[PDB]
Amino acid sequence: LHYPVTRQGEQVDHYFGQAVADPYRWLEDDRSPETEAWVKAQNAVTQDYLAQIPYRAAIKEKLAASWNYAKEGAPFREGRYHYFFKNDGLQNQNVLWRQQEGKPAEVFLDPNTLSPDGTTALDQLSFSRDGRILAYSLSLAGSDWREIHLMDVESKQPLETPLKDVKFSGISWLGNEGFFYSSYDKPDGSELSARTDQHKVYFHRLGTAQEDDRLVFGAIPAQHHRYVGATVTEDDRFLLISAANSTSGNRLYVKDLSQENAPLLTVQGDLDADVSLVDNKGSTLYLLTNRDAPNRRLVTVDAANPGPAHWRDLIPERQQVLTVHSGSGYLFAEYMVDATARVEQFDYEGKRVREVALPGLGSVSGFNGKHDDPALYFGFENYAQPPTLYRFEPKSGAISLYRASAAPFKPEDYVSEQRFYQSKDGTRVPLIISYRKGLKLDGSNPTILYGYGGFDVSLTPSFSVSVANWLDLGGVYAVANLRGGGEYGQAWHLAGTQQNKQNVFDDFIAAAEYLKAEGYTRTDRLAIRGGSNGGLLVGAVMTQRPDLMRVALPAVGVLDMLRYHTFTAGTGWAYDYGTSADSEAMFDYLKGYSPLHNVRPGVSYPSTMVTTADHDDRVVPAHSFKFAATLQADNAGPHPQLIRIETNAGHGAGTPVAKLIEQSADIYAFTLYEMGYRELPR
Numbered sequence: 001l002h003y004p005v006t007r008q009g010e011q012v013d014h015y016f017g018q019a020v021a022d023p024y025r026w027l028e029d030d031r032s033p034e035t036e037a038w039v040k041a042q043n044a045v046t047q048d049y050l051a052q053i054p055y056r057a058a059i060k061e062k063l064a065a066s067w068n069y070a071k072e073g074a075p076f077r078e079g080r081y082h083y084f085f086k087n088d089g090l091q092n093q094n095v096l097w098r099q100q101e102g103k104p105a106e107v108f109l110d111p112n113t114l115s116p117d118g119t120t121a122l123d124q125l126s127f128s129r130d131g132r133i134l135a136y137s138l139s140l141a142g143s144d145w146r147e148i149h150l151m152d153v154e155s156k157q158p159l160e161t162p163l164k165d166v167k168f169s170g171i172s173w174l175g176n177e178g179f180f181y182s183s184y185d186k187p188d189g190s191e192l193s194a195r196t197d198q199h200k201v202y203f204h205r206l207g208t209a210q211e212d213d214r215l216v217f218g219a220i221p222a223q224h225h226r227y228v229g230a231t232v233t234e235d236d237r238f239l240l241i242s243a244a245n246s247t248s249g250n251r252l253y254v255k256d257l258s259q260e261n262a263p264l265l266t267v268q269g270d271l272d273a274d275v276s277l278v279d280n281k282g283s284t285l286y287l288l289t290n291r292d293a294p295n296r297r298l299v300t301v302d303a304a305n306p307g308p309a310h311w312r313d314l315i316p317e318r319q320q321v322l323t324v325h326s327g328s329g330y331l332f333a334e335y336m337v338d339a340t341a342r343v344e345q346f347d348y349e350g351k352r353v354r355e356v357a358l359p360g361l362g363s364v365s366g367f368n369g370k371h372d373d374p375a376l377y378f379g380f381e382n383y384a385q386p387p388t389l390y391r392f393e394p395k396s397g398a399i400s401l402y403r404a405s406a407a408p409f410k411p412e413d414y415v416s417e418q419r420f421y422q423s424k425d426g427t428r429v430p431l432i433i434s435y436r437k438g439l440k441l442d443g444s445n446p447t448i449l450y451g452y453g454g455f456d457v458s459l460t461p462s463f464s465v466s467v468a469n470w471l472d473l474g475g476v477y478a479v480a481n482l483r484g485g486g487e488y489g490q491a492w493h494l495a496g497t498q499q500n501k502q503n504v505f506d507d508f509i510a511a512a513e514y515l516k517a518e519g520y521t522r523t524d525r526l527a528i529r530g531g532s533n534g535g536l537l538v539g540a541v542m543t544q545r546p547d548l549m550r551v552a553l554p555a556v557g558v559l560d561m562l563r564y565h566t567f568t569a570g571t572g573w574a575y576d577y578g579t580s581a582d583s584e585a586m587f588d589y590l591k592g593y594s595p596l597h598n599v600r601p602g603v604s605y606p607s608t609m610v611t612t613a614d615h616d617d618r619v620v621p622a623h624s625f626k627f628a629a630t631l632q633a634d635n636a637g638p639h640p641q642l643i644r645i646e647t648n649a650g651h652g653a654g655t656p657v658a659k660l661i662e663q664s665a666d667i668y669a670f671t672l673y674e675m676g677y678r679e680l681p682r
């Protein structure tokens with residue numbers, strides 16, 4: 001093996017009188033020659049280790065082959081054209097097609113033509129009210145930064161020069177005059193690591209330069225927020241601006257566009273609850289909120305006096321988490337029943353029309369359309385059921401199959417069961433276990449336990465070609481709905497935030513134990529996977545309980561819990577993690593589980609494959625660099641401690657299919673090989 005030598009510096013930070021050594025501090029410099037050479041050496045050693053796995057190629061071959069099938073999205077009208085995304089099978093990026101009556105479908109926007117390896121991706125797309133102008137945002141090399149392009153839809157040629165410095169932004173048109181978007185300002189230093197916290201809302205008027213765009217919110221001191229958004233209602237009557245400093249909680253403002261220079265009225269002036277616009281009807285706004293409702297509710301209020309004390313329930317809170325979509329003149333309430341979906345159709349007066357029956361137990365998507373759409377589309381899927389499209393007739397409730405999946409996976413071939421286990425403190429936690437029919441609970445099944453746990457994020461049934469290939473190889477895939485998540489409302493989330501964070505790691509640990517106790521797998525056949533916050537999860541569990549698994553796979557994880565907040569928009573996660581500068585108690589708690597600071601010399605850690613990317617500006621790469629250098633430094637047993645740095649890729653969204661395939665191939669090969677397999681399972 002032999003890892004690349006990683007020099008240790010003399011950096012020492014102090015937190016409330018406590019001194020902490022950070023020898024790999026130089027690795028935080030993403031622009032230095034030393035770091036670049038380091039990444040290269042590391043990738044080199046990883047590829048050389050992987051090259052030793054005989055069936056690596058067979059696995060990649062299998063993945064690419066099963067991934068290679070036609071995929072198509074649901075159609076949407078704009079002018080005399082219906083638009084729709086498609087993928088011939090292995091196109092690095094989905095292509096947007098369009099078709100008009102009496103003519104063959106045509107390619108409209110093909111992202112693949114923008115980059116050699118398809119690393120440029122299309123994020124947001126917003127047509128002008130009349131559908132003649134299209135504004136759409138592109139991501140370069142997987143970064144959170146964006147450029148908004150403007151195309152004349154008819155000729156498909158550029159209208160104006162692209163807007164720059166956009167980030168975490170929507171695109172919401174005010175009729176056909178122009179649109180609102182959000183921007184920060186290029187920071188001095190690397191735009192892939194330097195802190196940004198004064199998000200701003202701008203209005204770009206068509207036929208003007210970007211330097212002349214009016215600043216709508218975020219410039220004066222009283223409006224300084226880390227995250228701002230803007231949405232103009234479908235009927236162009238109200239502008240809704242949201243402002244937040246963290247990923248949970250936001251202020252909300254409304255401006256009556258039907259009047260000349262109307263002032264901003266406060267819908268919510270504190271950060272004590274999340275509140276978002278769904279739609280309006282006349283002067284009434286329809287808002288989804290968790291204020292005084294842990295599982296959320298839909299309320300209405302007259303926009304001329306929108307304060308929270310004036311909100312009135314339209315869809316009262318229930319025992320299950322509520323999310324609302326609108327379309328065709330109806331509100332569609334989606335509820336979460338133990339991580340699976342249920343849908344109810346309501347009219348704008350809060351009267352329940354009917355309960356919409358779904359294909360099975362899994363996740364639904366869709367039920368989003370304009371007031372005037374005569375039909376709505378929804379998707380259904382789960383761990384063993386590839387994405388299926390349905391067309392919904394709103395008035396009668398008629399449902400018909402729009403697109404059956406072309407994936408080479410028979411759903412009847414698998415089992416995806418839900419179990420509930422208990423954590424250290426007694427809490428009952430849900431676990432969905434998927435695998436190919438005919439498995440035997442003899443504790444020998446190669447298993448991958450997946451978890452996230454935080455940020456009110458819910459892990460609902462989701463289909464993946466990678467996971468389906470793992471099930472085919474005979475593996476088990478288990479997803480735990482850990483606290484910290486949003487599965488059971490705000491309380492579930494908060495039971496996993498700040499100084500309660502350890503509850504999340506305890507739930508994951510207890511899930512691992514349940515899987516062995518129930519006979520699905522055993523320690524040397526167990527791997528744990530997690531990304532971002534789920535990366536912290538893997539990092540925390542492997543350092544606290546290195547005896548628990550055989551393989552650990554932390555992806556783009558937050559590993560230095562003491563400095564995380566000093567990068568990009570990490571501070572935006574203070575609500576969930578708290579920071580080392582909050583108080584000595586918070587510092588101590590963070591230091592107490594921070595993965596980077598809990599790796600210890602002499603400990604035998606599992607075989608690990610830390611994965612990250614050179615353009616991840618959500619979670620700077622330095623987190624994984626330092627974690628990996630420390631493991632290579634401190635590990636004592638025989639297990640490899642490797643890191644795989646993806647090139648020209650970011651946090652995740654928009655990654656080319658070719659890269660996703662290579663990634664999974666590397667991870668599945670490494671995992672089975674580290675579990676001792678010399679030939680593919682069977």
Ligand SMILES: O=C[C@@H]1CCCN1C(=O)[C@@H]1CCCN1C(=O)OCc1ccccc1
Pocket residue numbers: 448450464466467529530531532533534555556651652663664667
């Ligand atoms: O390549 C396959 C691996 C091994 C088993 C599960 N895998 C996965 O990639 C799973 C399924 C899709 C999301 N996922 C995942 O790990 O996401 C990590 C992530 C989460 C959040 C932000 C960025 C990255």
